[PDB]
A paper describes a structure:
To confirm the unique structure of [name]α and establish the generality of its binding mode with the [name] proteins, we sought to solve the structure of [name]α in complex with another [name] family member. Nb.1 binds at the junction between [name]α and the N-terminal lobe of [name], but the details of the binding interface are not resolved by the cryo-EM map. The N-terminal lobe of [name] could also be docked into the map, which forms a binding interface with [name]α that is very similar to that in the crystal structure of the FAM46A/[name]α complex, as shown by the good superimposition of the [name] N-terminal lobes when [name]α molecules in the two complexes are aligned. These results provide strong validation for the unique structure of [name]α and the binding mode between [name]α and the [name] proteins as seen in the crystal structure. The C-terminal lobe of [name] is not visible in the cryo-EM structure.
The [name] (also known as [name]) proteins are noncanonical poly(A) polymerases (PAPs) implicated in regulating RNA stability. Unexpectedly, our structures of the FAM46A/[name]α and [name]/[name]α complexes show that, despite sharing most of the sequence and differing only at the C-terminal portion, [name]α adopts a unique structure completely different from [name]β. A helix-loop-helix segment in [name]α inserts into the active site cleft of [name], thereby inhibiting the PAP activity.
Author numbering:
A (entry chain C), B (entry chain I): 57 to 90, 121 to 205, 214 to 226, 289 to 322
C (entry chain A), D (entry chain G): 6 to 125
The structure:
Amino acid sequence: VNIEFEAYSLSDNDYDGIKKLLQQLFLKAPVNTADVEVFGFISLLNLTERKGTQCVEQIQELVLRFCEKNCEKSMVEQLDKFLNDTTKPVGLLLSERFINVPPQIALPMYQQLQKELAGGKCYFYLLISKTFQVTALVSLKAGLIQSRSTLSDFQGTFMTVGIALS
Amino acid sequence: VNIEFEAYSLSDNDYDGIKKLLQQLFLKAPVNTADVEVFGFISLLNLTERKGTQCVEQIQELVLRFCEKNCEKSMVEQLDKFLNDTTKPVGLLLSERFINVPPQIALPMYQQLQKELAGGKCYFYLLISKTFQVTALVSLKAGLIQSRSTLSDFQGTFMTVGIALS
Amino acid sequence: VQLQESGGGLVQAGGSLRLSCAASGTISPRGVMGWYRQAPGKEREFVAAINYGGTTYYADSVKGRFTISRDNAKNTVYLQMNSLKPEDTAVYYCAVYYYINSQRKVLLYWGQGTQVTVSS
Amino acid sequence: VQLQESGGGLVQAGGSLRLSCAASGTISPRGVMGWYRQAPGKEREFVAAINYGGTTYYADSVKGRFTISRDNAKNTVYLQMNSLKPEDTAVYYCAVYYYINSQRKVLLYWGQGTQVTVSS
């Protein structure tokens, strides 16, 4: 099972709305302590579970719906339901066990996801990114992959991890 | 991973106490509807989880403690903690998602466990049995096995199933 | 809206049956009526469907053997089943559904189904 | 009860170190003092232990190279480490524990550990 989506066609305020969407997600969970922009989350999943596969139906359906023709302004509203609907698997999985790691944790996890994506643990990622001042490029990557450990054993199943890089 | 325990050395009131212990367990959960004695439960487990392996530590420790020399009257008290301690993985797993199936469901599941034990899904079973009037034999079998489906897809992970055959 | 299936039964291989599904109420002109089958221990699969305007759809497994038709005045859909095979043995259910758009189907009503058995 | 490790450091392979672990309070005569080591990215493993009566225990990896001893008047345990190998590089922790019975060990106190580095 693989599901990989990338969009380079976003508007500055589409990026800017989704960033706010992710930010509430951050503020809404436990916070932890002990150029380019990147924001999003990396959630570990178990596909032998009901939750695991119930999520995937939602994720796959969102991606299917993102493959609509004029489906671009809608991105920001469709993401609003997706991740903020607790009446739903993905919005529910992000209210429970969402942890906010500081950037020194986050960068290694981004970079390894970025390696693993380029070339057994089901990971769910949603990741926006801006490269500048001006804006040179805006990118929403979001996918379901099975790979090598990105978590440092510091993460459990249905544990989600916050990315926030500036 | 395999863990299999059988004891044919029980007293009539050791059997009779454990039966009461299992019975409260039955009364304490949702009840479902749509010669020899056998009583116990069959609980499906996922070993890639924390819960799954936290249970096994308890199960393995109970079995280790059952391999003590004079450890027979203690069986009834040690089982009392084991399965009724919600401050503990196994006593907690039996308070959540314990389902009581009628005997027409239960017998097929016993019989298949009895086949699979004789000769990938981690199952946890605890099973007492009397063969008579008089008492000819009393048996406490209890183990951790990985096998073929005993549940009829009617069971989920960390779902436990009641056995009660008369 | 209730859907009432009928015309199931036992038949020999190569034989024919005619299933009927009557609706207790008026089906919207947006309503598609479809037949689905469920073999023992299998999921429910699509067999054939017909829209209000008479456009027909068939599964590849029944194409050239089965013929769906609809009577709008009787609120009834028919499935003529010819050249029956042992693999056509299933419970056959009718359903009413409509499309919101090209990607979104809403199933509204299911019938209770009718048994078809094809003996060798 | 605090346990204070000392005598860690850098040494060449084949060399020797003497670790010491002092307890801030009186250890019960039922108390066993043990050394444990944790290499980078590894679990904490047993090295050696000594009971109040001077009975010694060693891991097979250090047998014939290391010698544990205890001073009951100073509440101090020593680990003489001879013929050091690169694989002896770890943080070394002392602990106080006792046996309730033949199967049940209770760990009471852990020290903060001392670094040992064995260079090639």
